[PDB]
Amino acid sequence: SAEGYQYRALYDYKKEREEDIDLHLGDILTVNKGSLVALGFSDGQEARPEEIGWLNGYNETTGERGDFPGTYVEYIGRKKI
């Protein structure tokens, strides 16, 4: 997709698995809209990452991509990617 949902990390997270990424307070993540379409959460639940569970996206702040817990982040809006 040409669109991304944006999140900001509210807490630090140390990666627990190879596919995970580290989060640091204030990091900004972009989840491709296609990812949430695929999971069935694109009909509004993008704004409730704590209800989705694990997310996969790009940490714009660190340049790393991978899985991170949705309860650790806040939805901040969407952008073109």
């Binding site: 807490y11 630090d12 997270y13 627990e16 569970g53 694990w54 817990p69 949705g70 309860t71 650790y72």
Partner: peptide, 9 residues
Amino acid sequence: KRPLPPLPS
């Protein structure tokens, strides 16, 4: 689903 970790603190 993979379990979520609790929030830190």
